[PDB]
Design a protein around this ligand. Sequence first.
Ligand SMILES: Nc1ncnc2c1ncn2[C@@H]1O[C@H](COP(=O)(O)OC(=O)CCCC[C@@H]2SC[C@@H]3NC(=O)N[C@@H]32)[C@@H](O)[C@H]1O
Ligand SMILES: Nc1ncnc2c1ncn2[C@@H]1O[C@H](COP(=O)(O)OC(=O)CCCC[C@@H]2SC[C@@H]3NC(=O)N[C@@H]32)[C@@H](O)[C@H]1O
Lengths: 322, 322
Amino acid sequence: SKYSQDVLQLLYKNKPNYISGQSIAESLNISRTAVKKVIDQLKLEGCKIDSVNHKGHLLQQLPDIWYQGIIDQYTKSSALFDFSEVYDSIDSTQLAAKKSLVGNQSSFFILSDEQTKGRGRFNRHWSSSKGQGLWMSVVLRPNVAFSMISKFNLFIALGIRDAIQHFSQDEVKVKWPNDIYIDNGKVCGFLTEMVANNDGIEAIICGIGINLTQQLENFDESIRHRATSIQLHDKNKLDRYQFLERLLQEIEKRYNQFLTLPFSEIREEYNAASNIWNRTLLFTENDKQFKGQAIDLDYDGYLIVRDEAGESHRLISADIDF
Amino acid sequence: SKYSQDVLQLLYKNKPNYISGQSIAESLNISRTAVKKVIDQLKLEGCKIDSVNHKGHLLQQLPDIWYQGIIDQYTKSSALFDFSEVYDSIDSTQLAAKKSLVGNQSSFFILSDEQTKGRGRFNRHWSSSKGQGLWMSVVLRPNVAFSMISKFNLFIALGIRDAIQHFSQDEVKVKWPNDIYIDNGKVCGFLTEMVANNDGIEAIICGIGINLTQQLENFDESIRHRATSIQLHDKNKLDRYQFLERLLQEIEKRYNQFLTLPFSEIREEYNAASNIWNRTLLFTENDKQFKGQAIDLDYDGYLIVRDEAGESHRLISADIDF
Ligand SMILES: Nc1ncnc2c1ncn2[C@@H]1O[C@H](COP(=O)(O)OC(=O)CCCC[C@@H]2SC[C@@H]3NC(=O)N[C@@H]32)[C@@H](O)[C@H]1O
Ligand SMILES: Nc1ncnc2c1ncn2[C@@H]1O[C@H](COP(=O)(O)OC(=O)CCCC[C@@H]2SC[C@@H]3NC(=O)N[C@@H]32)[C@@H](O)[C@H]1O
């Protein structure tokens, strides 16, 4: 109802103690029995809430659904984000963020359980199933030249991989410049765009798609082989909210390093994290197609590549297949 | 009314012939006498329309007001623009264009008689009086690396200066990187921004403010000395629609050269057009302030400057005062 998120928030705020119906009612100024309907609705949606006579209610577990009420708890404590927006379904969180950032200097993110026009790099289709992934656009406001887009991307990849790794029993690796893999499975793709002019960057907009709970039967047999989800490498249920916390934690960490460090500092780290060495890569550039080997990432994040004809290239970006 | 622009369009379409009320009525399927009300309203707003018994109506002259109906005539014939949007008042055409470009690949421009939150470079206030200037945001879709923002700006400046010059009896000059001057008066400022990522530019967004009809009494005595309007250098009334045509013509011209030429081609031209040589410039960079002389623009649009201490700098952009 009008009050479902409010109650949800109060329940989450009060962990690991119980609060009575009564206490909630006084808080939102509503009847005890309206409060009982909101709770039955929530349980219906798959919240695990223990209700005990005389004692009240305790939130034990959130379902695979994003709730603004809870997300707002995350934003209030945030040193980075002014606010978030949370949808059940939308055309794309990047479309939404690119609209929201206009006319303001806010730092925010946008989550949605499903996207109906999810898009990746080069405007490829990005499958955004309901209930099954984190589909998020992050807007930040670093004031730094536009050239620095590329460097943002390098720091952020480690942010994302560290948080996925915290949950995967298997090795999570970066595939430069925008993919996160677990073994042979693409578990994430991120897209960093910006709004800028010559005098600088007006906003950065990072779109992050991370697969959380797909079973393989859940990917177009067609990609089933280079796709995977955090769940297929966690022995425990993967809690979507737990994960968001760690992801934000990592993004903040990794975003401050972006503002305070040259790429060389994390270059060796980034290197140990990647999965493009000692194997043959497929490169694509408008029309052209050719093979090569990655031999290094230089102090400036450019990839050094020896193509199939022995020629050397220094790439600030690429699209690479295995 | 509902039909004011429709009638306006038909009137403009039929220049230099007259069309009867009758003929308009059949076209829009409305009464002859509804048509007579629309025309009286237009004349009221300051359209000069000659009405002759038995012969009909001829549009002689548009007032200092933008009309979608007429602007649509400009867009239909356009090899560049999918469409335009035209407001009487709005917060800013750049805010509007940055919103409209999302989720599509359209090339369009946005005009508004007045802006209430006009902004320039570095987010400075940009005075946008009603009736008195062209306040326009141009969205285009060049697919070229993001590094090319700077070069766009160089080609476009000549576009703008050529069209202003066609109307000024006095010498119009560029003040790199974003100003157009007539003698000592800033007559225009333009702002080029973009939306991009590493793989390329999603849109370019050029905000153009050109002063058309201000009398000096019309500028905060405070800038009256480094401000001027096209009108203070045209012996003839300056027609705002005539001017728009020439401006678009120039922008298209100059945008194709942007796609088909290196800066060196127009470098000598650009040079002969600028007004920053042989005089002392004031430079500003966050916090810092210092003097210098422009000695050259290099093949790549970077300004070569000898500062007050004999040191040399190579600037892709700056803010400069006289
Ligand atoms: N769930 C999935 N897992 C692995 N691969 C997928 C996939 N869905 C589609 N693909 C393929 O993986 C590649 C991804 O395309 P790219 O490499 O160009 O580009 C992208 O990888 C990154 C896109 C990030 C998506 C986030 S969702 C939050 C947000 N909102 C947006 O609309 N985008 C973002 C293509 O080959 C796709 O066909
Ligand atoms: N009408 C005017 N003529 C000359 N100077 C002006 C002016 N109005 C304000 N100023 C000053 O001129 C300088 C202009 O600032 P900058 O150099 O940062 O930056 C700008 O020059 C360019 C802005 C272009 C405005 C177009 S209007 C269409 C559109 N929509 C937008 O909101 N912007 C655009 C500052 O010193 C202002 O205080």
